[PDB]
Amino acid sequence: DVARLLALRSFTELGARQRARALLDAGSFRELLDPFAGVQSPWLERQGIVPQADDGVVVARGLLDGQPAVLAAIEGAFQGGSLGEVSGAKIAGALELAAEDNRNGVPTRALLLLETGGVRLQEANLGLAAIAEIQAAIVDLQRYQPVVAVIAGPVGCFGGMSIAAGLCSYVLVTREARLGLNGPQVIEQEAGIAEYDSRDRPFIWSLTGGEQRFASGLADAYLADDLDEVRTSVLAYFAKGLPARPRCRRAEDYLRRLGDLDTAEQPDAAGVRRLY
Amino acid sequence: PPPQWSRRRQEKQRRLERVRGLADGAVLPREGLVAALEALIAPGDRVVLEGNNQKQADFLSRSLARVDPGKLHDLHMIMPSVGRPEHLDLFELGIARKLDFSFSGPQSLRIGQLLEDGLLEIGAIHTYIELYARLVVDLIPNVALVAGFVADREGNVYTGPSTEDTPALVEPTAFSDGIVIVQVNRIVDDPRDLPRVDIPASWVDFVVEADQPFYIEPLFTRDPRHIKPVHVLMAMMAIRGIYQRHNVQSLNHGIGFNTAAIELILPTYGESLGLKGKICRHWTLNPHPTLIPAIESGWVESVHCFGTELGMEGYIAQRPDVFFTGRDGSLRSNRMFCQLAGQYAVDLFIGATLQVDGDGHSSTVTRGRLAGFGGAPNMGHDPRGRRHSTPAWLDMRGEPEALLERGRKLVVQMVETFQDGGKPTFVERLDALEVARQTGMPLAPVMIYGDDVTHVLTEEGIAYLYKARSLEERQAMIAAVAGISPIGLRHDPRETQRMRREGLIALPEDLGIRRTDASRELLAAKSIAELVEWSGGLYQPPARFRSW
Amino acid sequence: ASRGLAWFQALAGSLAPRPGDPASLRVADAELDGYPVRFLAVVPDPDNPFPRARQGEVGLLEGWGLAAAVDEALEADREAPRKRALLAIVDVPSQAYGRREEALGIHQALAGAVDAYARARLAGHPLIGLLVGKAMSGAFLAHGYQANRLIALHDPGVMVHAMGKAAAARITEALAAKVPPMAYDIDSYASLGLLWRTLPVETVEVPSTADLVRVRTCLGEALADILGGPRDLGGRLGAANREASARVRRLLREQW
Amino acid sequence: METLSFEFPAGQPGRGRALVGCVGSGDLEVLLEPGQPGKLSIQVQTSVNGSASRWQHLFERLFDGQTPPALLIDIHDFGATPGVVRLRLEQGFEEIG
């Protein structure tokens, strides 16, 4: 089956713009604030850092199965996908317009492709402020339409935007996805090598990888790194509409299971799957 | 031609013979002009009398006021501009009774005064070209009293830079067996010394050498010394948020300091935006001295002129690529033709006003003061007979693929939220409403109606009214830029952000403008003397504006 | 023990945690100018079941607990004549860093908090964040950053940022005074247009009687400024330093 | 003529001083000096009678949702429009920082 192996169409291979063009209905892709608009970071140059013209986020309108849609995709290759003033505002602003579409009869859905290492330090407080607006906009929009967050790798999703991911109606992941609040190196240097070893990649993936997140119910779907399969899963979850009982509204249940936990010793992947 | 079909021609013939002894062919003696006027005009006559915006037939005007009211009374005056004291003297003296007019400036109080006392009746307040229009329908005149620079003995008249309303006033009078009297500054014996013919001898019945040169008012000349930072701020937002935004190629500026400020910062602020040659190429405008630096800098490709601004004549004669000049080399203004162009052929009108209400209705008529509309109604409305597209005019459509949606002319009301004297500009009710009730006018004398306005521009920002989809939304937009005026106090400031984001309004900072950047330093010329400098000494300011 | 704890006690009088809450949360209902109010403050719990969340951090229990307390008020007031104000007293050093935290999905717990708050604000609850000390990173996101109005005490101990000075400087002193979004001081943060008011106090660690008078008056005015107006966060887009945030939204609607 | 006093919540004292404008007709001057923390004190002397609530509105909008530096502001107004007043106040605050 060389033919199959020669025909692999990986989703994680694609850049952000490529991922966005692929997931939207063929022909429907239309980018807002595209690189020729020149709307880049106003902060990076004075700091000696070369800007990207779309500031590392692709925002496109289009269709998802005939239906009105907007898609924001973070380019993990620029600044490690860490969000700045402009990139943050592009995502938040788009989510905001989608909610407003819905209040005017138009059932616009948002797709979020989250390749991001959190907040951008050179624009720190503007990146964090934007993430707050991103989060607000997700909650607003999800009174009308579920937001699907796709986490595929290689960067995965960390920091403020992992919290944003937790807000989403549906979180779809690959095996190569990591979804976590703090990055491994930071936990190591805050809590010690004993707490967390940043060089142990199999350990890291065992706790924060896509496979584990899905198995522990912190993710809703576990997809092959395959373009067709990812679009198919995306289209299916939008078609489900809003979940009856999303993760976020289950504070009572999480707080109760967390109570039953003996926290004296460090849990492992298996324990977490058991606890939930 | 049969007698019963030629009564007007017969009546003219009888008037002409009552001065045949008194006159030498077409030439009237300056000494017997008053006698001539009592012979040639009859009581009840419709008399066109040049109060143009600038040119005054003031010899004829003063001579008419010295007439025996027992011989001439109940005259129906038709005047484009009613500015001079003798004009209203006619009514007080009982020589005149009715008045149709377009513009009044100073005499605004006096006209109201004469109206209450029953010494003057207003037919209607018009816009200039509307008034010319009636002259071949509704108000065919009996007599025209007009002015020129030079005549020959046969009646050909040169009017030059001050042509203005004259051909529009004389043609309906000359060709309806009416009587045309022209005062000229000098009569030449050699008909070849006439620099150009503007009004042919055929149209003219009598000429008179005036006792002195006919009075010229520099109506649109503005002293750049009086331009303040708040003007410059509004002017910056006009250029950036309107001219550039909508790619405006052609325009008229209404009178005033607000527009003068725009003109004076094109070669500074406009230059900084990189817009030279890209906007404001073609003008319908009086030759504002304040436009001189835009012209020298190469912004202004063409200007067609309503009239002339005293002292600009020599400068215009050295700019024939820009202005319309005759074979003698001097300006040929034409108020009718320019007003027509201002309506039909130009992207945008922008002007100031004294009062705006919550619906955008705009007026200069305030209590006791019957100010005329002048040109503002003709140029500040969407000309609904227009069919030719232009990019700015198309830019106003909400749906550029809707083939049945027509474009709109840009009509901007540019004004500070408050007037100099402490009264707010934006009011809950126009003074004009009560003036109509007191004057018995069937409708409020509104200069420009709120449904014609595409942009309200204020020191606070721009309201893009053309985007309003209901009256209520238009009110909200006006209130958002009306400041702390009674209209502005209706605005909830927590609504401003949304209006900004949706593009309903733009604050200066939406336009990349920092308010504190507005200052006189942006003015390309700071004074009249600097205007003369920019003109290479060609501009000769009238005494009024001299500091030397 | 923490500025947050002190100010919760100064404002709510109450001090013992509700049975049912984590020991890291202080919740109390009261009134402000006769308007129903619920105070909310994360505070240190040195006996936290989770060892990494014992110096005031927002960890698993803090995130989910906040979600529960806010959901409680949201539900209780669903038909009430007035939705009660939620006053977040913000003083959080950080997110909890640890293996339990990541393994159990601390990101998801903090999301529960954000979701609750935002849903409360959208439903007409007035949220006010009162920054009495540190407001850092995801801890601030989960506790405070969804507020209709943010008020900061004008004090050098009051600091908003995405990471601690130590961590920033280690991945790199305060050269960040050159770049407002990078700076730590409250004046720089203010210049981003994100605060509705700042107010200096007499004695920040234990508010004076005159301090409480000013703070309570301020909170009253914020409450008044919220009611009846837009429930979104658009009031945060007014400053020159956030020019680009406003421009992006303008450009997005033009092209939408 | 009247003399009016206003007070507003403010932050830390501004630390420069500034003078903007002139008491020409239709204009005003504004003196701006460091004030007492938490407080902005404004004194207005104006030729226009009965304009107190106008000045109140003007300042309210100027300071809406943005804590100015604590300053002492002395205004001498000879009938400037609210537009001119606002512009000068912004010029003054600009120099002070």
Author numbering:
A (entry chain D): 3 to 278
B (entry chain A): 7 to 554
C (entry chain E): 6 to 177, 185 to 268
D (entry chain C): 1 to 97
Paper text:
We next determined the crystal structure at 2.2 Å resolution of the MDC hetero-tetramer, with the MdcA, MdcD, and MdcE subunits from P. aeruginosa and the MdcC subunit from P. fluorescens. The hybrid hetero-tetramer with the P. fluorescens MdcC, which has 76% identity with P. aeruginosa MdcC, produced much better crystals. MdcC did not carry the prosthetic group, as we were not able to express the modifying enzymes in E. coli. A malonate molecule from the crystallization solution is bound in the MdcA active site (see below), so this structure is actually the complex with malonate. The current atomic model has good agreement with the crystallographic data and the expected bond lengths, bond angles and other geometric parameters. The four copies of the hetero-tetramers in the asymmetric unit have similar conformation, with overall rms distances of 0.2–0.4 Å between any pair of their equivalent Cα atoms. The structure therefore indicates that MdcC is an important bridging subunit, mediating the formation of the hetero-tetramer, while the contact between MdcA and MdcD–MdcE (400 Å2) is likely too small to form a stable sub-complex. The active site of MdcA is located at the interface between its AN and AC domains. One of the carboxylates (C1) of malonate has bidentate ion-pair interactions with Arg341, and its two oxygens are also hydrogen-bonded to the side chains of Asn292 and Gln345, respectively. The methylene group (C2) of malonate is situated above the phenyl ring of Phe312.
